[PDB]
Design a protein around this ligand. Structure first.
Ligand SMILES: Brc1cccc(-c2cc(NCc3ccncc3)[n+]3[nH]cnc3n2)c1
Length: 292
């Protein structure tokens, strides 16, 4: 830590305070993350993430285990998508830019997933943008390392808006399809300028999902009725047309959103397959209008 000078508190993450900081020797400007509670297991797992390098993954520069505390030093980026969407509310992110960002995030998932590494807590606050038209995933792999708590260290509620339904139904064993689902929800949110499923508890989240996509059953999701927190007593809602759910998204876009939104995680499109989807045939890399 003494090798850093804290420029400023950026905010309060899942695990702890996030600082913008300068390496007190090397000049480099970085994101510094203190991790609350170190266990041998988390070290070895964190250390596997330093090698998981990709242009659409926020680079983990260094892990520091000293004084029995744990800091993570990250490539610094100046804005997240949550804030960028807020800034863009009056007219929406232009579709060519939504496509570029989606395309790039799928590239980063496709990388991590091929090495068997999931995010598990994708969300706008976790997706970070620069002035070059790029977008990157933060905190990849940290959920397996440390868990995902209900409240942060500052009791701030961790949002459920982007959580896949197999998790909400108590499935113990997640696959990579959970990130696809989150990303699907983020994709719908960029398009409509409104969160898809803003639940404020687990059941409100589940039921919000149900009301839009239909209560899942053994037809669409084999094995569903036998998941840990499934209850025969769930209300049975009918599914809504996607045309109602995300206008004015185009046919290709709606078609892809649907596959990213499949109940059965096994049926849910992979990142790699999704990059091949006709939605992305005219993809480009526009530069965002950023005010820092
Ligand atoms: Br709080 C919180 C929760 C999850 C991720 C991050 C960030 C933000 C960020 N920069 C975006 C901002 C946001 C606001 N002010 C300055 C930079 N990062 N750069 C590199 N890792 C980062 N992790 C912060």
């Amino acid at each position: 830590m003494e090798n850093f000078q804290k420029v400023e508190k950026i905010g309060e993450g899942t695990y702890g305070v996030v600082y913008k900081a300068r390496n007190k020797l090397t000049g480099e400007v970085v994101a510094l993350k203190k991790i609350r509670l170190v266990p041998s297991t988390a070290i070895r797992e964190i250390s596997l993430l330093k090698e998981l390098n990709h242009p659409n993954i926020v680079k983990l520069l260094d892990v520091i285990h000293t004084e029995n505390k744990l800091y993570l030093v990250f490539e610094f980026l100046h804005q997240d998508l949550k804030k960028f969407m807020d800034a863009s509310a009056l007219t929406g992110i232009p579709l060519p830019l939504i496509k570029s960002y989606l395309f790039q995030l799928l590239q980063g998932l496709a990388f991590c997933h091929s090495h068997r590494v999931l995010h598990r807590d994708l969300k706008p606050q976790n997706l970070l943008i620069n002035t070059e038209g790029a977008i990157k995933l933060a905190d990849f792999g940290l959920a397996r390392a440390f868990g995902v708590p209900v409240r942060t260290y500052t009791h701030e509620v961790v949002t459920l808006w982007y959580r896949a339904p197999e998790i909400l139904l108590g499935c113990k064993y997640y696959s990579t399809a959970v990130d696809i689902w989150s990303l699907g929800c983020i994709f719908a949110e960029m398009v409509t300028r409104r969160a898809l499923f803003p639940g404020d508890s687990e059941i409100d989240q589940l039921f919000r999902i149900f009301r839009t996509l239909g209560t899942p059953d053994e037809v669409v999701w084999p094995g569903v009725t036998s998941m840990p927190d499934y209850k025969p007593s769930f209300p049975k809602w009918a599914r809504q047309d996607f045309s109602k759910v995300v206008p004015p998204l185009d046919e290709d876009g709606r078609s892809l959103l649907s596959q990213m939104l499949h109940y059965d995680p096994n049926k849910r499109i992979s990142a790699k397959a999704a990059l091949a989807h006709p939605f992305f045939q005219d993809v480009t890399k526009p530069v965002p209008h950023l005010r820092l």
